[PDB]
Amino acid sequence: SIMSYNGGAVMAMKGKNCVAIAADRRFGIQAQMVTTDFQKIFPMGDRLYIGLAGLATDVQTVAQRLKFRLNLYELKEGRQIKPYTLMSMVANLLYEKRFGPYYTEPVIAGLDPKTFKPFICSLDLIGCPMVTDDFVVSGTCSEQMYGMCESLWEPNMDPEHLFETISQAMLNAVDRDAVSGMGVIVHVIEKDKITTRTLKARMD
Amino acid sequence: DRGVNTFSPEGRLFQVEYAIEAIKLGSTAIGIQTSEGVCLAVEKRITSPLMEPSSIEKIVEIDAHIGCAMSGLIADAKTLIDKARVETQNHWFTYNETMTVESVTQAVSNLALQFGEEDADPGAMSRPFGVALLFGGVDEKGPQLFHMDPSGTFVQCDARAIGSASEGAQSSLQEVYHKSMTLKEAIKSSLIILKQVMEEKLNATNIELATVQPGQNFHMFTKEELEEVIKDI
Amino acid sequence: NQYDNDVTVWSPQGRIHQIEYAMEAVKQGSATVGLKSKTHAVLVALKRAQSELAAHQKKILHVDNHIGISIAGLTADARLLCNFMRQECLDSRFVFDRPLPVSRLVSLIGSKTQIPTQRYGRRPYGVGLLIAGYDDMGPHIFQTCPSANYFDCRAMSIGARSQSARTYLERHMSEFMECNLDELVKHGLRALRETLPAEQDLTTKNVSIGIVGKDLEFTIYDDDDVSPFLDGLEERPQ
Amino acid sequence: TTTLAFKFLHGVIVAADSRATAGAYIASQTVKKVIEINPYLLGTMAGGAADCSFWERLLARQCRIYELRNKERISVAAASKLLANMVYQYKGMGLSMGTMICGWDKRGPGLYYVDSEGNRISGTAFSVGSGSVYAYGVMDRGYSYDLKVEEAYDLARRAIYQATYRDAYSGGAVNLYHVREDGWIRVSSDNVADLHDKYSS
Amino acid sequence: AKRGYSFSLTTFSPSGKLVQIEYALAAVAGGAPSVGIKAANGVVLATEKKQKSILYDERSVHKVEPITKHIGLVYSGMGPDYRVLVHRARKLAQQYYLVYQEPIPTAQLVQRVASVMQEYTQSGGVRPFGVSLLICGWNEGRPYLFQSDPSGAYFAWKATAMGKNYVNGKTFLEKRYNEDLELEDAIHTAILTLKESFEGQMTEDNIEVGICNEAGFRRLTPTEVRDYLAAIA
Amino acid sequence: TTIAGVVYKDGIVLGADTRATEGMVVADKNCSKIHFISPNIYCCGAGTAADTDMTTQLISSNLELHSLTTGRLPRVVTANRMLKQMLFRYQGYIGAALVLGGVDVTGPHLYSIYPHGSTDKLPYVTMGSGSLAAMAVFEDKFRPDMEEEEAKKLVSEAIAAGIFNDLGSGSNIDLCVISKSKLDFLRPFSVPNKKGTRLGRYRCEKGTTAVLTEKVTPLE
Amino acid sequence: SRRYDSRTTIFSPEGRLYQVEYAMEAIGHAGTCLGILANDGVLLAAERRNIHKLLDEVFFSEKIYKLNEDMACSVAGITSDANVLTNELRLIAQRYLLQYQEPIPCEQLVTALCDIKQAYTQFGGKRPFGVSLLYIGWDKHYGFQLYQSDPSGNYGGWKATCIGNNSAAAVSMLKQDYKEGEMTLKSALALAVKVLNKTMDVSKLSAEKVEIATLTRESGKTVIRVLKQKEVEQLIKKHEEEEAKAER
Amino acid sequence: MEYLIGIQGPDYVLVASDRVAASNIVQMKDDHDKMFKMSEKILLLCVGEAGDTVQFAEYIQKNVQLYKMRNGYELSPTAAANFTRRNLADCLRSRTPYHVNLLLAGYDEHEGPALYYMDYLAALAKAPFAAHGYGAFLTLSILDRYYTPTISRERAVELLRKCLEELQKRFILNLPTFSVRVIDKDGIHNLENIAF
Amino acid sequence: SYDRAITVFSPDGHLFQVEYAQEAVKKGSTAVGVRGKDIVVLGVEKKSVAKLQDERTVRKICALDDNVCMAFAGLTADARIVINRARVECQSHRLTVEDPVTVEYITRYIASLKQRYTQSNGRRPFGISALIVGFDFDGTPRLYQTDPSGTYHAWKANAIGRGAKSVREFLEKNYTDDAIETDDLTIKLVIKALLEVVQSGGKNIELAVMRRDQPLKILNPEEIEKYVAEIEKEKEENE
């Protein structure tokens, strides 16, 4: 499998007035682990984040080319990007390479500027957006992440309760996956603050 | 204002006729064909004594058997000589032999009227080459000398002079040249005609001389080797 | 004065000056005579020299085994048109394995020379050619001009002072058809002699002859090869 | 096919066989495998016969234009790089070559190993071909930097000979070339059958 | 067969002015009067639509043209040149919607349309547009009004006039314009400032008016025009 | 995926499910499969999900450009020809199976468009993974010139048949009713399936996760 | 075809370019635009020409454009041709950020656009861009910087410069009050108002007619802001009372 | 087969590579250098295909030197690592891809010592220690055991020696000589070759 | 694409477009360069810096390679294009040929580039002259100069720009083996040549030196004033 070459897992979750995004930190080729500190979640505008899982090259390439189109959008228009606008921007970027796509599944998590509304979505390799009110997952252990999120998630959750939910949903799903692990980083996005935590995880 | 490919009421292109007028401003060059070989002589025309005399090379080799003297716009000539050097190596690669002097001159003559505005490539020429060339070399038919002009009309010559004082030098070559002369006489004669038409006196660092012969390859006369023929003033 | 800059510009009289200006280029070049019999087609051309110390210009070019030309006007336009004529003859022999008829080739010249006379920035071919060829129909003498219009002729002469040669060929036109190879060449150079002034005449250094027909392929005669044709002349009339 | 080249105190030795095979059948045993690029540069034929002949002749063409433009002789490092760049454009297409470019340079004796794959490495001794493995053995045992001119000939001539004895694709005649400062010279064109009597007696 | 010019027709004068644009601004000045007014509640665009011969079908061709569900256009000057700018504006609005899945902002459309108008002042073998554009729109809870001139520049307006007697219109508008006007009151002043230079009594066939608000852009029916037209609503 | 369309006396009823799967795992429980083309024509989608969205949006963009130039309501045949000529040009590489249906000035027109470019004009069509189950309902209970509420019942039963029998389809039933004067877009028409609410709460207590490093960044 | 050609990319008998020098005349008719360099920051001050009672005012600025996170520019000349050049500057800055993952140095972005403007003066047969630009920014190599661009495609680094209408009189006025090495942003703004007040056509000077933007590095990141209407009026009255204090 | 290893210190970068250029079953070259001088403080360790190694490493090398001449200042180790990644990533889906696994080592005037790991697919990753080849499978475990963030350069070479001795003991391929170079504040320094 | 012919021949047999570019180089600042025994030094004068301008950005001396550097005169916008195209060729030569670029080769490239712009359709000739300075691999000092036409010549001492004829005539009677013997005395010859035309020498002169093994060294105004003071002291000695 092309997606299972580098591994990785990205998760996003909805709360009351807050959005949380979590991803593993392992960078490795097939079986051999290479780097403990690998970035997969990228900032897009103070209160909007994107998590990319799949091929390590395409994770970095899409993030760089999306930032290329993001800054031009924020200079042409005197406003910060909307979550729905970025979703369509990623969908357009991936579909341009229809018959030769980037092997990565983007997950966007963040709050809507000026309207303070939560937003989560995940996309295909060719760019197919889907919006949910609960959770979106992407990676090698997709099935493992679905089993945890379907049992732990609750409708209205505060920032502290949402953090405990997304952390346990990642850790246990990651520990059943061989190609994912070596620490989990969580970004809790609020209207006032961004809380970044690196969780104590298994290093095997 | 008119186009580059415009005919005159007389029956010739303006850009070609103006290119011939450009040669009459350049330095004079004399080439003489002899049974023992072909010699080429040219004035370097040094403007300032600070300039290096070895830098000015109006006689250049195409192959080991062909040399050429140039006059007029020196910048345009270096493009034509470079094309001639490639064509000889392209022929060597394909046929495993050396080209005749007539064949090389004909190859350069193909690039004569390759200029225009409409219906042309983005990297095409706009104006003709304002250069008169004297191709002198030895092949299978013996030592040969050819003259080329902006129009592309190439012809064989026994003795030809082109440059500023070309008309005066041509009449002087008609009175000296004969069929049974030697190469040493051809070198001697060319220097006498050259010193008459030059503005400054003849000197070893002032002029350039080269000979092509059936015996050995194209040779450029060094400062010391010139002294043997310069001493006969 | 205001219409004589481009080929695309028409004169109020109904003329193109640039094509007429290109016709003057053929008159600037030296004279050449082309004539045919019933079995042979002969081209006799006069050579010019820039100086007595320089050799004489090539006036007859080789195109194919059965087709040969004599040029008058611009030298670079002559060789460019000759390369097209050489290629078209090679293309027909490559595909059909047969010699391309002269009537077909001359029509191809009248198609290629027409294009630049109608487009902006482009110029007409400032060269006149006398084409000699032999095929299934016999010997042929064709005349192509700066204008795409071509002529099928019994005998023709074009170039500088070619009027004297044009008048001689008209008075002896009925003799050419039953004329043999040897005498038919003598008729060609005799017309070429009339173009020259009273003092100077034909020599081995300024005369080229191209002969093609049933007996032999197209061959160009130069200096010592032209001497059997010159020896046994009628001499210049006063 | 066995081609070897090594550099020492006095210059560079070029040695090659002459056997060309079309499967099991031998096509020719008089193949000039030492390709004469210039009066100052030499090449070797290994792998593809036409692939070595065409591209090194294109190099021979390119090196002559360099001398006409720059008024100087082309360096061995530049000649090796030019050939490496041209063949690299056709990588993974079907070209097969294993040439060695030898010559005297401004820096001294030069030796380079150029492949159809795109390899370009400078070294003291190389051996290319099907019987190159046997050529490496005998060559390394009797090699020295302070070898005499006559002693350098005996090493390479026998090194090809020992390779032809084991390799089925190697044979014909042992061609030898010496590369000096003024230019290379043709040394010997001894037959394998004639050399068999020399080492036995 | 055709070629195509590659050289610019609009060039800098010795004074330092682009002559072709200066005359393009004179083409719109001699055109039909057109006005646009922003009123916080919505935008109103009105233009003179004189058919003259009565044989003309009024409802066949419209001067007020919609670009999307919330953006419209009004012009002054040449009809044919405006129609190309409508199609281009309609196409650019759709290209934005395919990428971002969001209706195009008014200011963002004008910037893209003005770039096309700039292109024709610098591209080879083309003249500038003889049309000044009035762009209205509703986005982000705010109404917008913009002007795009032949040069390619764009200005944001509260109230502006075009066509013949535009200087008389602009002076009339600044006296008549108020902050926090009502949309229905904005139509009144728009149809009145157009009557300043009209001469031949207004009928519902003589002028065309389009409104833009929170519901979107739409052209007003002749029945709605007739109600506003009889001096009072 | 189960999508269907029917033609009744007044107009057209279109049906679709809400299950979107990645392989053999449900990715989206609530997914819109009835797509907007024009204020009078709607189109159901099947096959490749990304191919269905981008092809629909491009035709909807072209028809909005078309309707504004003409100044009148677009036709179903115009929507059909645009989808027909594009999918044929790509030789079936764009995996988009579309059930097209709308009301024109001519009347109601229904089309079934295949990824290769073949189109069929029928009173009732079914496409997708559970099309076999949906067609069987039509081939048993369909009758010409039926009432609006009767036609809505016919399609809802067809989509439900694909939901319970086919593993590719599930969850909610979406309906789109288009007539000569009325357009009803019923998003959640019927919800036959729901989650059995969790009686055992697995809510993680505050401070059950071990944290190594913490960083707080203030915002405006 | 050649009859209608105006020959834009051609030389003059004197040894100069006509279409460039004619474009240079267009800048001298446009609004006055100046920028000076200080120790703690760098700023741009421009004369707004779009002054009307019925002007809507939607955008943050009229002539000040943002190109990068660390860089900003101003425009003098044709506003139509300016929108093309400023958009191109944003593209080049993002191409560098994609390739090297670092903000583009100030000198490198200016040279990039100057190569394009030089290309239009040499080939293409098209009219050159009649826009002169002033650049302000910060990089890790030199720090705070100020640049000036010409329609010919020529650039230069300045400590204090002006371009537009009355540029010759303004540059000599800047040459008088500027103290090299000891200039702060507080005195920089006071100097900018001093020059604009005397060189402008209409006297008195209002904040609605002028536009000032500042660039200062704060807490490890560059801050680019356009000054408020109330902030400019405060700077004018500080200068207005200073000029009245001269009569003593 | 080729082998690479890089160790980063507090103010230095230590890098080593084998000097073996092998074909089929024979060792052609005994002293092959796999380090490319990018700048005064940047080195490139290129390993992979036969032709892709020399062609790619030199292309980036001359482009970095082009930046130096055009601006006056040199590229930072971070900017050079992102530049060499961009060229490999853009060529990945093209007709001619470069199959090369490289390692970039550099010292910055402001940020300090830096080491970069990069896959043939073009995946850049910052690491305190990294290794390429089949020999990496035997050496990375030793690098996980004895490595400290505050390691001295005399201890780093001793740590490097422990890894190279493992290649003489367990690794099936013969790798006798290794090129050792250190990059610090003064630049690139050549160190004695560890031979067996 | 623009296909119009810009540079064309004239009734008198002259290329005006080339000659007008030669008028553009005359209007440019004065640039002189002399060839010494061990060091080669070039210098520019009459920069017309308003003191309020940064002197780093407006430098006419640019290094093409580690061994090659150049100084120009005329249209400064046209020069930067040529300099950048020359810098790419320096790295392109290194990719094709393992050996570095020689002084003559890079001059040959610039001259051919200027020649192609005088004969191609839709292109305008460069209005610049370049003083190419450097050392060969042998260690022999070299000095070359180009012009809008496309001709290049080697010099011992040459000046280009405004008042170039006045500086050349000064160097025709001063360039001797005694004057170019030491490193310090070669630099003094440059400054003496520039002060002949330039207005009050001091802050107007910008020169750069380069050694046989060491890279280009741009001397600061504090070092120039040291040499200028030494020139006036030797000028004072006689009278």
UniProtKB/Swiss-Prot annotation, chain B:
The modification Phosphothreonine is found at T47. InterPro entries: Ntn_hydrolases_N, Proteasome_alpha, Proteasome_alpha-type, Proteasome_alpha_type_5, Proteasome_asu_N, Proteasome_sua/b. It comes from the Eukaryota. Keywords: Acetylation, Cytoplasm, Glycoprotein, Nucleus, Phosphoprotein, Proteasome. The modification Phosphoserine is found at S8, S48, S55. The keyword Glycoprotein applies. The keyword Cytoplasm applies. CDD domains: proteasome_alpha_type_5 (cd03753). GO terms for cellular component: cytosol; nucleoplasm; proteasome core complex; proteasome core complex, alpha-subunit complex. Detected in liver (at protein level). One of its GO terms (biological process) is proteasome-mediated ubiquitin-dependent protein catabolic process. It holds the Pfam family Proteasome_A_N. Its main location: cytoplasm. SMART domains: Proteasome_A_N. Glycans are attached at S190. Belongs to the peptidase T1A family. Component of the 20S core proteasome complex involved in the proteolytic degradation of most intracellular proteins. This complex plays numerous essential roles within the cell by associating with different regulatory particles. Associated with two 19S regulatory particles, forms the 26S proteasome and thus participates in the ATP-dependent degradation of ubiquitinated proteins. This is Proteasome subunit alpha type-5. It comes from Mus musculus.
Swiss-Prot record, chain G:
Detected in liver (at protein level). Its main location: cytoplasm. PROSITE patterns: PROTEASOME_ALPHA_1, PROTEASOME_ALPHA_2. Pfam families: Proteasome (PF00227), Proteasome_A_N (PF10584). It comes from Mus musculus. GO terms for cellular component: cytosol; nucleoplasm; P-body; proteasome core complex; proteasome core complex, alpha-subunit complex. This is Proteasome subunit alpha type-4. The 26S proteasome consists of a 20S proteasome core and two 19S regulatory subunits. The 20S proteasome core is a barrel-shaped complex made of 28 subunits that are arranged in four stacked rings. The two outer rings are each formed by seven alpha subunits, and the two inner rings are formed by seven beta subunits. The proteolytic activity is exerted by three beta-subunits PSMB5, PSMB6 and PSMB7. The modification Phosphoserine is found at S12, S74, S172. It is found in: Cytoplasm; Nucleus.
Swiss-Prot record, chain H:
It is found in: Cytoplasm; Nucleus. Pfam families: Proteasome. It comes from the Eukaryota. The modification N-acetylmethionine is found at M1. Keywords: Acetylation, Cytoplasm, Nucleus, Proteasome. Detected in liver (at protein level). The keyword Acetylation applies. One of its GO terms (biological process) is proteasomal protein catabolic process. One of its GO terms (cellular component) is nucleoplasm. InterPro entries: Ntn_hydrolases_N (IPR029055), Proteasome_beta2 (IPR035206), Proteasome_bsu_CS (IPR016050), Proteasome_sua/b (IPR001353), Proteasome_suB-type (IPR023333). Belongs to the peptidase T1B family. Non-catalytic component of the 20S core proteasome complex involved in the proteolytic degradation of most intracellular proteins. This complex plays numerous essential roles within the cell by associating with different regulatory particles. Associated with two 19S regulatory particles, forms the 26S proteasome and thus participates in the ATP-dependent degradation of ubiquitinated proteins. The 26S proteasome consists of a 20S proteasome core and two 19S regulatory subunits. The 20S proteasome core is a barrel-shaped complex made of 28 subunits that are arranged in four stacked rings. The two outer rings are each formed by seven alpha subunits, and the two inner rings are formed by seven beta subunits. The proteolytic activity is exerted by three beta-subunits PSMB5, PSMB6 and PSMB7. This is Proteasome subunit beta type-2. It comes from Mus musculus.
Swiss-Prot record, chain I:
Detected in liver (at protein level). Keywords: Acetylation, Cytoplasm, Glycoprotein, Nucleus, Phosphoprotein, Proteasome. Glycans are attached at S129. It comes from the Eukaryota. The modification N6-acetyllysine is found at K226. It is found in: Cytoplasm; Nucleus. This is Proteasome subunit alpha type-7.
